[PDB]
Each structure stands twice: as structure tokens, then as C-alpha cells.
């Protein structure tokens, strides 16, 4: 009897080697100092 033909297989299980952060707001106007007094 002939068992088979597939000669070797010999391979096991192998695994090969192989920005929110800031904010979005605010509106700008020129600075206005010099209080009323």
C-alpha cells in the first residue's frame, strides 16, 4: 500500500518579525486702556 505523496510539510505556528488639545474661541479688538479718571 502507498501511504501518500506529500513529501515534507514541517511548519509550526509562527508569527513573523514584521490634535484636539487647544481651544477654538474668542474675538479680538484693539486694547482700550486709560480709565475714566
Amino acid at each position: 500500500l502507498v501511504m501518500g505523496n506529500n513529501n515534507p510539510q514541517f511548519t509550526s505556528e509562527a508569527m513573523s518579525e514584521f490634535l484636539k488639545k487647544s481651544h477654538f474661541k474668542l474675538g479680538e479688538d484693539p486694547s482700550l486702556y486709560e480709565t475714566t479718571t
Binding site: 474661541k25 474675538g27 479688538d29 486694547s31 486702556y33 480709565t35 475714566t36
Partner: protein, 430 residues
Amino acid sequence: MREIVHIQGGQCGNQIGAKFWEVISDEHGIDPTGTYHGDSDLQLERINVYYNEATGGRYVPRAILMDLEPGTMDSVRAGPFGQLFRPDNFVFGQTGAGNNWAKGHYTEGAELIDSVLDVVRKEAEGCDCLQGFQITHSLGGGTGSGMGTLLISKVREEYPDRIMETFSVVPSPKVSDTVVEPYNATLSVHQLVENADECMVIDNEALYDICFRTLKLTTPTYGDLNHLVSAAMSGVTCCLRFPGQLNSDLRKLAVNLIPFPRLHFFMIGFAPLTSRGSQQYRALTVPELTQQMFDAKNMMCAADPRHGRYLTASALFRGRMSTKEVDEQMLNVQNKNSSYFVEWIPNNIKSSICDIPPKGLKMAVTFVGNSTAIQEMFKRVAEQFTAMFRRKAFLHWYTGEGMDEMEFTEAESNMNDLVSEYQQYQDATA
């Protein structure tokens, strides 16, 4: 010279402070290296309120950053304006609380808090003449809600006549982040009502609603929320730093807003707040500012003031304006909304004018109001807490390191007593 120190606790408190100090530095013209590069002289005449002088001509904030896990403070140290803080002021634990009020108040707070009391003492009584303390924290987190309130207790015991201020973040059930919120919230409220001179409640639900509706921006972030909170915080104490037509500080505000000793839970709101597309369609004027101020939706809480009565109201105006117009608008509002104002307190709005507006704005207003509507928050929190405590859910974690059910019963009793006392004046008649 009547300066106020800053103590921030917990992850939420640290995030709040990291933006508040950026806002203050931007306002006062302090560079991230701590070197002054301002444009006028008024920016330095009252800089001693929030800063300290060091050798070489640099300024250092008088802030104390305390927490149980070093991750948050390591994150905020590497960010912008993170080099201002003195590296000594960083105090941290090694284990954390794990959203446990018992751990944050009994088992790690007792061991750690000695060092932070030492540094608070050093910073506070190294000053010329202390004005008070201000604290930022949230009542939904264990380490904050516990260690911060124990700090409040010890600081109040050592300084009985100073002004204590807290910006509290109250957890809402609609947008919930922790399943143990009712327990530590109730315990923190019970420990806070006895000690804190002033307390303010902020709600992330209301912040989300404002950011979605008024600013009309698609995706808000915790940066934006912290920016609104920082603007609100700076609005309260601007008058203490800048000259104005009518000057008014924290003690004056507390005296004029607190009728009875245990009624010191306020809600705040800010104006103007307009979207970028409609920013210039509006006109900056006192009537528009006051109507947006008294708009119910603009408030930073889910407690709707139209469901109750305003005991008192406060409005801090920033900019140059006419006092006759301000008074006329206040009187007009108080007459047009007679139903929502309790009657035995005639002329129950305080007003103030500060000549220096926020940077980038010509007119801005900070509003603080004490209305009988906040009792709904207390009622809902008490209902959830008693529902959870009826079946003794999650109770073993809290009872395993010192507490008994008697303190929880006492907290429920005090919370209900506060609710009843606070709703008593809602229906009172003259």
C-alpha cells in the same frame, strides 16, 4: 496686599487651573518664560495680587498643585505656560484614591496632606495681608472631593476670618461619568456647607448646551469648557485688580449676596457670548448685555431659575459705561420680572463697574445669582443617593476603611435639612 492664593485639586481642578493661569498671564502680559512684556503701566500696579517676585526680574504664580497621581501634573508641566509654576509647589501621592471619597479623605489624605498644609502656610503667610483662598475642584471625583474638602476644613480652622471661595463642579445624571457620584457628592456637600464661605456650581451639561447653542461650534472640547470657566473666574476678581467707577471685592460680594449663613451656593454666567459668524451682527450695549445676562439658558447650571425666586442678584460690569444706564436697566428688569424676585428684599441687585475690559472685548459682564431653583439639584442628588443606599450598593468599599452607615444617615439628614430650609424662603410672604 489683599492678595488671594490659588489651590487646585484633582484632575478636574488641575485642568481648570492650567487654563486659568494661562488666561491670567495673557491678561497681565506675562510671557511663558515669566518676563513682563506688557503695553501699559496699569498692568503692573496690581500684579502682586496673583504673582510673586523672584530674582532676575521674573514673576511666579502663587499656586499650589496637589493631587494623588503624578500623571495629570506631568501632563500640565510640559504644556504651554507650564514653566511658570514653582517646582517645589508640586505635591503628589503614589497610589491615588480610585474615585473613593473614603480613600481621599481618610487613608491617603491624612498621610499626604501635611506637606500641602506646610506649603499653603508658607505661601499664605508670606504675603503682605491675605485676602482669602480660592479652590477649584469637582465633587464627582474621589481624591478631589475628599482631600480638597479636608484641606478646606483645616485651612478654615487655621484662618477663621479669611474669605474662602470654591468653584465646584457638580455631577449631573443626564451626562454621568461615575457610578459612585451620589455618595461622594453628598459627603462633599455635607462637609462643604459647614465650612466654605462661598461656593459656586458648574455643570458640564450646561457647558455643552452653551457651546452647542450659542457659540454654534460643531465639536467643543474640555479646552473650550475650561476657557469659559477661566473667563468666569477672572470676571469675579477683575475689580480687585483694576480701578473702576464702583470698586467691589469678594468680601463685599459675599456680604451683599448671602442673606443667611448656610445659603452660600451660587450659580454664575457670562456675557457676551456670540458665534464667529454673528459676532459683528450684534451691538455691544448695556441692554443687550443685561438681557443676555438674565437669559435663563445662558446660566452655567441645569437648574432653571424660572422655577424659583432670586433671593439676590449680582452683576459685575467691565468697561467704560454710564452708571445711570446701568441702574436704569437693573430697575427695569427688577420691575418687569416682579414674579421671579422675592418681595421682602427691595432693590435686590448689586452692580459694579470696572474700567478695564477683558482682552479682545470692549464690554463684558460677570453675573452671580442666588435663586431658590438650585434645590432641584439637591433633591435629585438626594433621590439618587437614597435609591442607591436603600439596597446598600457599593457600600462595602466605603465602609471597609473607617466609615459606618451612621455618617451616611447623618449626611442624608443634613442634606434634607438644607433642602427644606432653602425651599422655606421660596414661598415666604411679607
